Amino acid sequence: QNPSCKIMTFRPTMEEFKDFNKYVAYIESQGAHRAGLAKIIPPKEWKPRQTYDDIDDVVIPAPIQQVVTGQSGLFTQYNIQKKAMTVGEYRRLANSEKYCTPRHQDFDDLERKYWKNLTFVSPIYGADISGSLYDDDVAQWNIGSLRTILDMVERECGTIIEGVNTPYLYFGMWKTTFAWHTEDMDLYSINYLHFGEPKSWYAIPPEHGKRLERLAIGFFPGSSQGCDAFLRHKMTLISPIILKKYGIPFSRITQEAGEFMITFPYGYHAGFNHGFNCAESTNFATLRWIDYGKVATQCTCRKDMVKISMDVFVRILQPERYELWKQGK
Template sequence: MRAHPGPQRGPKASPDAPAREAQAPMGGSGRRSRRQHKLDVAIQRHQEQEAWLSTLPDAPTYRPSAEEWGDPLAYIRSIQPEASLAGIALIHAPVAPALAPGRVLADVPGFRFTTRIQALGRQRWTAWDSVRFEEGDREYTLEEFAAEAAAAEAAWYGGLAGPLPPRTAECEYWALQSSPNSGKIVEYGNDVEGTAFHPCDPLGATKWNLNVLPHEPASVLRHCHAHVPGVTSPMLYVGRLFSAFAWHVEDQHLYSINYAHAGAAKV
């Protein structure tokens, strides 16, 4: 509580004092007007993106039985005729992991990772290699990166922590990407060698463990004798609000399988 000040002596009020006092609310109203304008612009941007995003169908979703889950490649072949029409599918595992990814990675001695800087906004592509991701200048632990990501997200959404509905973030992302050189950047921990699957975990012990899947008898990757990180072995990607992963040539010619260990939805 603040003490209420008692009577104070000061200079006599000038004749134009009431006018100055009358002008103060106008300044406050102007600030409110600017804030309201920003909110109106944000709503308009959301509506513009929602207009075209709402025309896109959701990815087909599958929930295999425990028996179907036992043979990953056979199950993928069974859904291929339908899923290939969409180009993407969401598969819900019938097995829940017992260990959080943070606990698995905590057992990896000295686990730290660097990031890449992604610029948000429409970039001008003048040459094959003109748009690049810059390397970040520090290393993170998982806890450090999560704390910074949560703080940045809370600041972006006006001080509220926690993920918003995926469509809200998706509309905001595309609004930023459609703006020329928004000046905003985001860090993304990508191409991190390692795995958050534990071989003794109920999920990690299945053939869907991405360390195991490439070596299945029916996998074409068994014939690739070179070690290719991200193809013959998994890589970790530690994202945050508005970070994005580009489509690669191997995604075009092979099935790309991603497992979301934790965090907000990937859209």
């Protein structure tokens, strides 16, 4: 289907767009998952919200100052928690002189300016906010209610895993960054950019993910020694010059306001915001996910980490393999 593993962009009509679950199966039937990442531009009619007129009042409980250290294309990003602030106050910060998007002539220029300036001013990211900007009104592709088999997890123990099982908001500013990672438990994710400046993405095909991991162990041997899933700490940045230097296949794509991105199981991704914006995201699953969840690595060195028991998925949805699966086989 997609033997070169290009990132595909889809432009569904309303009728095609209607049923989220069915649309995921469709894009996979066209090979979208091979890239690890896909863009879906929803039909022009569809709006998740009538107006964003009052957002300035929204509280960001725990903005993070993103402090990037390193050199020659290899960095570590520490996120220091700051005091709560409103989106209004955040927006004004984003557009102040210290923080504002650099003058640039096009994307290649901006991207150069991102990688060149990463360690200087630490941007503030209004990340990981529990909430949704969708109107209650909205039936299709509603990040707060996608209805996939991921919903089984909460059914089973009453555990909500914020951001995984519930929607997160991210108010971004220039240079705010998501490090290289795959999702918790190698889940899919869906990401909608509500408004504002773009969010750029780098993605490595799932079939080359292990190559990335071997690369990263070669870059940070102390870290790999400390934890057998250290990329899951989500602090490793690696430039596209470096990926090219070590022959890691990747592509890049820029998501603009009003567009969805979907990441697929074991699709490594990373990227950065161009300027003030607002995105919404959560995780989801399909049957095809289960085998990834079964073998997903887990961080062995922190206690704060997302773990989902796969027992219910195999028992109910892979019943013929459940008995063997219980005994290591």
